[PDB]
Write a protein that binds this ligand. Structure first.
Ligand SMILES: [Mg+2]
Ligand SMILES: [Mg+2]
Ligand SMILES: [Mg+2]
Ligand SMILES: [Mg+2]
Ligand SMILES: [Mg+2]
Ligand SMILES: [Mg+2]
Lengths: 195, 226, 204, 125, 212, 196, 222, 233, 195, 196
């Protein structure tokens, strides 16, 4: 798929992901949710080749849910991101690699800190205050570089995110049909239904 | 790379230059190209440097186990046969081009081995990018019944031809002499005709020239007691 | 397309009097796009230091692999691995992937704990060891580093002088490379103390 | 054909004894005496060359064997079992160490590898 | 490369980076990507360096011949169209050009024409061309107003190049600023990105991600 | 490469040049292309040196193991083993081998095995890049039941012409004589054969 | 297929002083891994106190230098023996190069001399004619090895004044002709060590108001 | 753009104290076929210049005609055609170099490598190279094709730099050239035993030697070489 | 460029043309007018390869304006369309063909009839009640086939045109930044400034 | 194609086979490859039939116009005209021509013009696909100043072998004898030359 953004503020991680699914010459859907809840305090958004994206996301989801049951314990965002990276690093030298890029937004309940991890299809992991995949960063990073502060509130983060989306809507040739925004914090995961 | 091998009266000598390159860039100015397969069986490699090192260590390892198993000193023909059958199996993908030389109870030997698994016998041989320059010298001055001193001279002169005329070869001359009924003598940097001249200037900086943001002690030690 | 120059970055290592120095830039990119300015390329296993340039996923993977292997080494050997031994381990580990290699340019640096001898080594992506006395370079600005090191370097530099030499070698090389920079780190390594310094440089 | 003995031939008896190991130790007891002494600047290992016949050339039968340039071995018990263990010990010093680290294994780790081979013959099928 | 130009109340701001690369190798940090066509007209350099240099100094010669013959300043429309018609003749041959022809005349006011080696000729208010164009556009779009002061407009152009210089690997070195008025362009100096970045970081509070 | 094998009254003689080239560079000017797979079964090698050396070594192994079990193998048997390797691995081999041997029962025999892996029993055979230039000469000058001296002259004159015209061939003319008397090696230098 | 281009190696270096200019270049000429000549002059005095070198493909290099020397001669005929200023020469060379825009001279050209105020001047050209006045420019095979060193030692890049710790830059003090020649020699000595195509000899042409002077130095021949 | 059909291999040459020597074998190869054995590839121009040519023979014959035509043209309205206004090596070379570069620039090259050897009016040695690309260079020793790789190393041991030229006699120089031709015969698969050699001396003039042969060859050691590794018989 | 539509109603021709100009990754302009007035009662919209489109359109404009002055007479839409077709038919076998598709909307003052001509870059002319170029027809023709009547008013034509644009905005992946609409009738050419 | 021209005491003889193939199909089995460009200047054609026919026709035109102005042309002159066409148009021609002629002053002369467009004056020349197989035979059997009968036998035996081995050659052996006496055509059929 197309645009996926992430921003880590003071006490939460915000993931924004486009709603469009374009298969061919037509936009088949304009309400697609490009994300999966891996654990109560860990959310993963994804973009890449058709089929591989959802197949990979659901496979990771199942594995983390399995771990959660076995140990009766939620893995830290760092631990989940390392597991995901390894799977992608394993994938790149396979017969047919997963063509999937992901952002992992999580709230570490032990450290009481939000954490955003950016991982591409090669297994290239980076922890960031804000991140993106594909061409999304080209349009948005100059705005994020300018306005971002580590002590931002969730409401300020959403305003900076709106500015990023507005710039995308202005200068991107493709119509990505807006974004679904989700917030990850100490209380868990919730969707901002009006954006 | 320039590598040569020269037979003489009571043994064999191999030699090599000491330049290893990455394209047009000189990675190491004093590389050691003369490798040991066994105490008295040495070889020089050209082509893909990792392959030459890797294949000599593998065969060198299996040669040692074979020597222990048979209670006999290793033979050059064994190293040759094991090298060629290995290289042939990989159909040239292991880019190892070797000159193998040594002494054993059978006598003194000199072979070349190409990456596809073909081998050759000779009294004088050269391999590498400077092989043509070296072979020109060998074809001009080689004769039958060379002495130890003449063979060392000829071998190093052939390497020099490569050093000066071949851009892929340079720096120093390494030599190893394997004589019958004697310990093989490895002569590292036998010639040193390419020492860099003193620079016009010292580039030692005044302390505090570099701008620094943060300093910290790195904990290399283990977790401490108490 | 070329895996060794997608992410960019550089590592340089130098020997001095009773000391070694290893340094790297902090950039990680997706070709033209700068992605991270905190991507450190130097790691250490006990007192042995390893810099790795090239494809970033392989840099990460190999670090995790050598941590894995040096940890088991220590449990069985009951001692920390030495630079000379680790160099051979890096070489063996790379060559076992001969026909499906990690796209990296590793650089080993350290001081032998028993002999006190300073040691550095470099490798190609496939395992060939370059054991230079003076210096080792790696990455997308390796040509620039070769030029800087060749002119700036002199033997038997004291730790605080060596710091200036290696820092200036890295900085000016990185400033002539689009895919290197965005910060830098320098390790000064002595037999029983190691100092880590972050350098101030242009951020373009 | 096929090796259809995929089960252990050494098992715990009701008393907790591993019979085949005890019986192996009995065979070692019958074997010729060998010894080892450690000094400050060296180690010595020794044994008797019990020649089965005076026509036999006892020099060809090596009871003391080089494993690595810095490691040697001697035994008591069944000679043929020793000979194959020496072959395996020499090879494992290369395959599981020298071809990885570019140097010969330390005494304790080579011993550990030999011990592992002997343990496996105590549990494998 | 990152080049921009935008119209505003006080005329036109032109801002460019200074970096030139051959692959990963940084060939130069001191390249002039603003061609001074004449005292009243400016052009930006992107794509092929020589193609922009050669044909825009040639354009200056054509503009000079025009005002000698017609006894009148050439319009920005006419100047841009001389260049676009020229490159259109070469279409297919392999010219590489992405430029903004900038000027300020009586009849037109401040005018910017984006001219292209495919033959494209577009009049517009804001243009950004080069490998770092997307980064510059972001800062421009969110901060641009027609009623900007000459001081603030100059800073906006400088800051937008800095944004690209930071993120885009093939942009950097230094920033060149120009202000185009009806009486001619005015040069506003060369600004090293290295020194500018830290200065802007501190004074503005931006680039918190970067450690300084 | 210029190689040939010729049957005659007392047995068979194998002949070959000594030039091995890498492009236009002569990598070896004193190559031995006459190789022994058994006491009185030899072969001439053309094509990929690595391939033909590998094949010959395998054949020598097979005939050594054959001899241990069933006694001395026939020349036909040796040719069959060559063929089996060349035919079954035709996709990965570039080998053109002439097999020549002496039995007491069958006397001198020559078998040629071209690229495809077929077998052809002949009175004489020619092969290698230089053979093209002497098809006319050899066809006009070969006779059956020649003497040893006549056959040596026939091979010497033939390979002399092949060497003269083929740049890929040259050096010395090596020969191996296979008869009841035993195995005799011959060598002929440029100054001798060039003036013919 | 016929390839009209080739690579003759070589490395050149131009440095502009305060009242002088130097244009240096190694004298080695190569194809692939072979040496054609250990002494084949690459930097030329073109008259009117201008020195030039066109490094890369030597046939195009020689052709361009020949045409520029010719242009200097005809400039004198057409304009009453007027001296061709370095800036005018630079613009003229652009048109020579751009004339073959679609079948380029495969060279990296550098000229050096004095400007009309008597100050040191160096101009640098790409193969198709884009040019620019510069203070310091290495060209050819070992350009990537030399330029970073020059950024550091000529322009004092990344060098700060001790005690201030990154707050005060090292001041850009003017270098003498003797100081520049030291940096040129050390640049080529280092390039010779680490680049296989560089070596044999170093020839430096020094331009001042008094005229053009030559200096030659040996380099390693391996 | 073409491909070479009938080809000539190495031309080798060197300077000595009083002049220059140049040599080339008499073979015209047709791929791997050693087709023509009586091809003269050293072409004298006047009594002061010898042009040695390797590569495509049809283009060599064309160049041979251009040089023949050049002598005719120089004699036109020239009373000093056999004196002060005779053709110099430097004139002949510059002409060829111009032609070679023009032809490569039209994407239709003369597929050759050429060495012009001679002695100038003032007694100076002239030795310069030019090829199908129009690339030119001069050196105390010059060689084309395989000669570059095998002859130059040997010839450079005699004259390693400019200062070695006055120390090198014609006997030493000729000896080195003849030895180099033997080495090329051993190792170049597209070479022949028969060759021509030309000496241009400032005192004794042009000495053109035809029908020379490579002699004193070492082959006896071949008898001892058996098999490719393990074979004893 | 991208989308150009045309519809001939009772007494006028309506041309709708997208405003976006994309150059690679960015949308450089969102107010581009892809049309030229050839004569007072003849309008031509155009879409195709960059540069060629405007170069061709202006070349045609100049030629028709030249004819208008020479004869003091306006050519009929049919005559103008035939001239344009010939130029494109001439172009397709040239060294470098004009890669330009056009719609010619005109009001014939002699016959008192609106006329819409569709001509592609090959010189393929067709007179139509409604037409398009590129992928525009794929989305819009089913709606036009359904709703179109030859006796429609200009206001009804604009409503049907809005429905076509809405369908394009829904199902096309590319953001064409809306359309500029122009009406050609007996009184001449005028732009609908609110759409 | 197998073609040759041989000088001898009384003049020169041109020889050729008669097979013309399109792939493996023999399009013409009785082709005349010995073509006349002047009374006593003929040529043997190999390569593209269209090219060599076009060239020959142009040469015949040139020598006819030459004769009208300057009298009988030399064999060297005819070879020069052939060369000029072959060399200048080398990119668009596939022609391998042997030129043979008889003057009274120069007697029998043979010139060969291979693909590149070079000229080589020789005592005898061989060319065409089948020539490869008789380089050895012709080199061993050619003598200078042979008689007419010896030269006919030399050519007959040579082309017989070329035909025997080359699939592209075959049919009849045509010959044309050029002497002071005049022009004599000869033909030799398969039943005659195959049994040689
Ligand atoms: Mg990533
Ligand atoms: Mg950079
Ligand atoms: Mg940047
Ligand atoms: Mg094979
Ligand atoms: Mg030969
Ligand atoms: Mg060098």
């Amino acid at each position: 798929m197309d645009i996926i953004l992430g921003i880590r503020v003071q006490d939460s991680v915000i993931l924004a992901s486009s709603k469009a699914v374009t298969r061919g010459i037509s936009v088949l859907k304009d309400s697609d949710d490009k994300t999966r809840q891996l654990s109560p305090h860990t959310l993963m958004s994804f973009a890449g080749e058709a089929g591989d994206t959802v197949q990979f996301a659901e496979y990771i989801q199942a594995n983390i849910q399995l771990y959660s049951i076995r140990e009766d314990y939620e893995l830290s965002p760092q631990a989940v991101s390392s597991f995901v990276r390894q799977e992608l690093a394993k994938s790149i030298r396979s017969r047919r690699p997963y063509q999937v890029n992901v952002l992992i937004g999580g709230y570490d309940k032990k450290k009481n800190k939000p954490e955003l991890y950016q991982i591409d299809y090669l297994g290239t992991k980076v922890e960031l205050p804000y991140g993106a995949h594909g061409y999304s960063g080209f349009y948005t990073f100059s705005l994020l570089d300018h306005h971002y502060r580590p002590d931002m509130t969730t409401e300020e983060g959403l305003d900076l995110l709106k500015l990023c989306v507005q710039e995308l809507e202005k200068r991107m040739p493709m119509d990505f049909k807006g974004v679904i925004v989700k917030i990850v914090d100490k209380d868990g995961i919730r969707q901002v239904d009006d954006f | 790379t320039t590598i040569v091998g020269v037979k003489f009266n009571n043994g064999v000598v191999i030699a090599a230059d000491t330049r290893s390159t990455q394209g047009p860039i000189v990675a190491d100015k004093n590389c050691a190209k003369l490798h040991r397969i066994s105490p008295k069986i040495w070889c020089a490699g050209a082509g893909t440097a990792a392959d030459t090192e890797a294949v000599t260590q593998l065969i060198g390892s299996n040669i040692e186990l074979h020597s222990l198993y048979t209670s006999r000193e290793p033979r050059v023909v064994s190293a040759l046969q094991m090298l060629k059958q290995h290289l042939f199996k990989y159909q040239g993908h292991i880019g190892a081009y070797l000159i193998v030389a040594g002494v054993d109870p059978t006598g003194s030997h000199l072979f070349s081995i190409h990456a596809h698994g073909s081998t050759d016998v000779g009294y004088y041989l050269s391999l590498g990018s400077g092989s043509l320059a070296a072979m020109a010298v060998l074809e001009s001055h080689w004769k039958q019944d060379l002495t130890k001193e003449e063979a060392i001279k000829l071998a190093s002169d052939a390497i020099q031809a490569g050093i000066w005329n071949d851009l892929g070869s340079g720096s120093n001359v390494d030599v190893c002499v394997m004589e019958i009924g004697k310990d093989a003598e490895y002569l590292r940097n036998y010639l040193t005709p390419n020492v860099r001249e003193e620079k016009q200037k010292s580039y030692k900086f005044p302390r505090g020239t570099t701008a620094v943001l943060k300093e910290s002690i790195v904990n290399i030690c283990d977790i401490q007691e108490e | 397309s070329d895996p060794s120059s997608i992410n960019g970055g550089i590592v340089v290592a130098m020997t001095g009097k009773d000391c070694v120095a290893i340094a790297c830039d902090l950039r990680l990119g997706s070709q033209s796009l700068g992605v991270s300015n905190k991507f450190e390329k130097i790691f250490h296993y006990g007192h042995v230091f390893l810099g790795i340039t090239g494809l970033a996923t392989d840099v990460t993977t190999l670090n995790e692999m050598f941590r894995y292997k040096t940890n088991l080494y220590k449990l069985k050997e009951e001692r920390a691995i030495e630079p000379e031994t680790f160099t051979q381990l890096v070489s063996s580990s790379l060559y076992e992937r001969r026909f499906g290699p990690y796209f990296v340019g590793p650089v080993v640096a350290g001081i032998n704990s028993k002999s006190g001898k300073p040691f550095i080594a470099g490798f190609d992506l496939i395992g060939c060891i370059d054991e230079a006395k003076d210096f080792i370079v790696s990455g997308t600005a390796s040509d620039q580093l070769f030029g800087m090191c060749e002119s700036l370097y002199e033997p038997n530099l004291e730790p605080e002088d060596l710091f200036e030499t290696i820092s200036q070698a890295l900085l000016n090389a990185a400033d002539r490379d689009a895919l290197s920079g965005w910060g830098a780190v320098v390790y000064i390594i002595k037999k029983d103390e190691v100092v880590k310094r972050y350098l101030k440089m242009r951020q373009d | 054909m096929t090796d259809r003995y995929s089960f252990s031939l050494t098992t715990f008896s009701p008393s907790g004894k591993l019979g085949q190991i005890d019986y192996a130790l009995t065979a070692v007891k019958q074997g010729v005496t060998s010894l080892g002494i450690k000094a400050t600047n060296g180690v010595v290992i020794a044994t008797e060359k019990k020649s089965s016949s005076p026509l036999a050339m006892s020099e060809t039968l090596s009871k003391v064997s080089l494993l690595t340039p810095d490691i040697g071995a001697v035994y008591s018990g069944m000679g043929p079992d020793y000979r194959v263990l020496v072959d395996k010990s020499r090879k494992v010093a290369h395959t599981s160490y020298k071809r990885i680290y570019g140097e010969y294994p330390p005494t304790k780790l080579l011993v550990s590898e030999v011990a592992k081979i002997m343990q496996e013959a105590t549990q494998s099928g | 490369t990152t080049t921009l130009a935008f119209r505003f109340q006080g005329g036109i701001i032109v801002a460019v980076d200074s970096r030139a690369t051959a692959g990963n190798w940084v060939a130069s940090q001191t390249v002039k990507k603003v061609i001074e066509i004449n005292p009243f007209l400016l052009g930006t350099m992107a794509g092929g360096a020589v193609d922009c240099q050669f044909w825009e100094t040639w354009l200056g010669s054509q503009c000079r011949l025009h005002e000698l013959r017609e006894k009148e300043r050439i319009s920005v429309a006419a100047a841009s169209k001389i260049l676009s018609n020229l490159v259109y003749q070469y279409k297919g041959a392999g010219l590489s050009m992405g430029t903004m022809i900038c000027g300020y005349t009586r009849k037109e006011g401040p005018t910017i024409y984006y001219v292209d080696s495919d033959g494209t000729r577009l009049k517009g208010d804001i243009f950004c061309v080069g490998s770092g164009q997307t980064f510059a556009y972001g800062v421009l779009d969110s901060n641009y107003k027609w009623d900007l002061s000459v001081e603030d407009a100059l800073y906006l152009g400088k800051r937008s190049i800095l944004a690209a210089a930071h993120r885009d690997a093939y942009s950097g070195g230094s920033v060149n600023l120009y202000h185009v008025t009806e009486d001619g362009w005015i040069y506003h100096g060369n600004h090293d990105v290295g020194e500018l970045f830290w200065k802007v970081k501190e004074e503005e509070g931006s680039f918190n991600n970067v450690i300084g | 490469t210029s190689i040939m094998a010729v049957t005659f009254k007392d047995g068979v003689i194998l002949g070959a040049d000594s030039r091995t080239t890498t492009g236009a560079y002569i990598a070896n000017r004193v190559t031995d292309k006459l190789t022994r797979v058994h006491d009185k079964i030899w072969c001439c090698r053309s094509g990929s040196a690595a391939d033909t050396q590998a094949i010959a070594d395998i054949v020598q192994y097979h005939l050594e193991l054959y001899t241990s079990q069933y006694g001395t193998p026939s020349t036909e048997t040796a040719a069959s083993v060559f063929k089996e390797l060349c035919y079954e691995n035709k996709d990965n081999l570039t080998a053109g081998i002439i097999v020549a041997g002496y039995d007491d029962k069958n006397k001198g025999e020559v078998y040629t095995i071209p690229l495809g892996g077929s077998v052809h029993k002949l009175p004489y055979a020619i092969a290698g890049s230089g053979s093209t230039f002497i098809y006319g000469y050899c066809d006009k000058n070969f006779r059956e039941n020649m003497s040893k001296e006549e056959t040596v002259d026939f091979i010497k004159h033939s390979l002399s012409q092949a060497i003269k015209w083929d740049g890929s061939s040259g050096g010395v003319i090596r020969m191996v004589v296979l008869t009841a008397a035993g195995v005799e090696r011959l060598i002929f230098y440029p100054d001798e054969y060039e003036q013919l | 297929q016929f390839n009209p281009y080739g690579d003759n190696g070589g490395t050149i270096l131009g440095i502009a002083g305060e009242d002088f200019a130097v244009l240096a270049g190694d004298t080695r000429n190569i194809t692939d891994y072979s040496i054609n000549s250990r002494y084949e002059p690459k930097v030329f005095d073109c008259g009117d106190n201008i020195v030039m070198s066109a490094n890369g493909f030597a046939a195009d290099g020689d052709a361009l230098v020949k045409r520029f020397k010719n242009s200097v001669k005809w400039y004198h005929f057409d304009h009453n023996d007027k001296k061709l200023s370095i800036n005018s020469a630079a613009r003229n060379i652009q048109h020579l190069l751009y004339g073959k825009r679609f079948f380029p001279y495969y060279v990296h050209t550098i000229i050096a001399g004095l400007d009309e105020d008597g100050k040191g001047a160096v101009y640098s050209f790409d193969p198709v004619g884009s040019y620019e006045r510069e203070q310091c420019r290495a060209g050819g095979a070992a350009a990537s090895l030399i330029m970073p060193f020059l950024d550091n030692q000529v322009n004092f890049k990344n060098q700060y004044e001790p005690g201030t710790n990154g707050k005060v830059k090292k001041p850009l003090k003017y270098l003498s002709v003797e100081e520049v020649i030291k940096l040129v020699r050390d640049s080529f000595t280092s390039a010779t060590e680490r680049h296989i195509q560089v070596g044999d000899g170093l020839e430096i042409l020094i331009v001042t108001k008094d005229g053009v002077r030559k200096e030659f130095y040996e380099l390693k021949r391996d | 753009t073409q491909q070479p059909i009938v080809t000539g291999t190495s031309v080798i040459s060197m300077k000595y104290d009083n002049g220059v020597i140049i040599a080339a074998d008499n073979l015209g190869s047709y791929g791997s076929l050693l087709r023509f054995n009586g091809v003269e590839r050293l072409i004298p121009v006047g009594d002061n210049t010898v042009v040695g040519i390797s590569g495509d023979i049809s283009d060599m014959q064309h160049i041979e005609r251009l040089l023949k035509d050049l002598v005719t043209e120089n004699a036109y309205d020239n009373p000093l055609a056999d004196a002060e206004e005779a053709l110099e090596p430097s004139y002949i070379f510059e002409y060829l170099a111009t032609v070679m570069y023009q032809r490569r620039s039209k994407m239709n090259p003369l597929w050759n490598a050429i060495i012009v050897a001679g002695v100038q009016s003032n007694g100076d040695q002239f030795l310069r190279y030019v090829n199908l690309l129009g690339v030119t260079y001069s050196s105390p020793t010059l060689a084309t094709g395989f000669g570059a790789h095998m002859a130059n190393p040997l010839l450079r041991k005699v004259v390693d730099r400019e200062s070695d030229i006055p120390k090198t006699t014609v006997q030493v120089a000729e000896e080195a050239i003849v030895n180099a031709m033997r080495v090329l015969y051993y190792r170049d698969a597209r070479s022949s035993r028969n060759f021509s050699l030309a000496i241009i001396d400032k005192n004794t003039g042009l000495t053109f030697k035809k029908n020379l042969q490579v002699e004193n060859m070492k082959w006896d050691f071949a008898k001892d070489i058996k098999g490719y590794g393990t074979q004893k018989i």
